[PDB]
Symmetry: D3
Subunit: 97 residues, 6 copies
Amino acid sequence: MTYHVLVQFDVPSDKREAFAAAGLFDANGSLQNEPGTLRFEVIRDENNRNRFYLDEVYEDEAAFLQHCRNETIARFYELIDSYAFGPLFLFKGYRVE
Amino acid sequence: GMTYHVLVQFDVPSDKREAFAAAGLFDANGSLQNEPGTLRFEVIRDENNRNRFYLDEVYEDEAAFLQHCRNETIARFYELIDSYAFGPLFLFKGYRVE
Amino acid sequence: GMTYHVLVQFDVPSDKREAFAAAGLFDANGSLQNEPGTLRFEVIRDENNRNRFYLDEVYEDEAAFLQHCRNETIARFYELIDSYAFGPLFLFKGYRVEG
Amino acid sequence: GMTYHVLVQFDVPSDKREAFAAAGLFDANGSLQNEPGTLRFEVIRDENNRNRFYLDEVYEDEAAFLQHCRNETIARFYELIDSYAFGPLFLFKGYRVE
Amino acid sequence: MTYHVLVQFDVPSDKREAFAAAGLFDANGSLQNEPGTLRFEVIRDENNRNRFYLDEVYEDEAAFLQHCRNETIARFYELIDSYAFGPLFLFKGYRVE
Amino acid sequence: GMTYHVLVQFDVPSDKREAFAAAGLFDANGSLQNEPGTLRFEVIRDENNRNRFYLDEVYEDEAAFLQHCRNETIARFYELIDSYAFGPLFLFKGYRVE
């Protein structure tokens, strides 16, 4: 029963590259340093150039709660706090079989 | 690489939960076993909402998603759920940032 | 000038698709034939979700919409759908932008 | 007949309300003047949220909508709003009943 | 200082009275037996007769987490599990005083 | 008894979080002190999204809410936030079940 978390962010038009870099920093840092993290993808909406999505998967819920208290997500929020709208959690869920 | 991502949402009546879960798993396995362009297909149930499910799909490109929409696995899937399910609601379609 | 737009959303069970379409067409035809301030009333079905419908309504002004909300057609429309339909969900109310 | 309906939503900063309204009106006028398959194109402002706009578009079929997405008018429209607008968010695509 | 949680449910048309009684049971039992539960309101949508909301207020986030673990909410879900759609959490947040 | 409840949502830029909170507090306090039909008015910050706020409003009935919409407190509130805020988005309005 993996734990899935889908997050959504909106950023101003002049901060598209800035957020993409911060999102990729969150992804690579979480994958390189947190054993509970199985997948971390950064996705851009196909039509809305200001809207991004984070598709995250963890071993269980405890691994996500650990991620929320680790250093990588703290630096990610330090990078984007001055412009980004979000997070909006589209869902949290468990994988079916 | 720059993969194509599709996120879908469904709601079902309370008495159809594992019926939908079974239908989604047949869709996932049939798609993976028959569609080289379909790269991922996960069935997810909301952690709190008992009646809500999500489908996390990844494709080679947009053309592979369109092919999936015309293949017979998806057609069987809708024949299973059409009498009770609410959806699909497409949360998003998008491209992976590398 | 500056017409009033109302977009409404409904969901129905799979076995009530024909019933709601008939009720929605009753609301549209009854409103367009009996209410002078009603300029347009369309029934639309989602291209992928066969259980979801939208009502695209346009009125003379806001006052014409308030009148429609108090008239006989909308009351009978809700009588026809109450036993099965989910809604309404108002997507928006707004004003036409003019040059 | 069975027309094809597209509803789109945009948000803009408080100081860009007139800029987007002019851009949407150009999109509407240019589409009506040049696209026979484009049957309607209205620009609507939310009654309470002055930063939110909607585009109510009608086409004779889905092919006509796809041609509109490829034509010059929408390309110029997106050049105008790219520096500030949030969107598009597609509220729905659907087919007229009767 | 208070912690606010807004919840949304949908029910079939023939279950409106049943859900109202279940929601009232949840509210009264929670308010009477949970000191951290300060306010708990059952609200019906003005237009959508099938849609209900729960407006809950707690002393802090820990009081809400304990509420989720207690017996009143478990009995609430036993009453509604056979028909209700939800819960959909509209938001959770903190009051600005 | 059957009070009337109104839930509202706003988004503001990252540098206007304190300005909007002060404006919402002015709206809340001015309305509660001066409008007998206004029974409750709460400003709520989202627990995760620092740019998103909500207003939880309770009234005697729908007439009392409509009167609030026509009064001076809300008019000054919108003057304070017009240059930056996104909204209002009315989540719902409804009646308390007793």
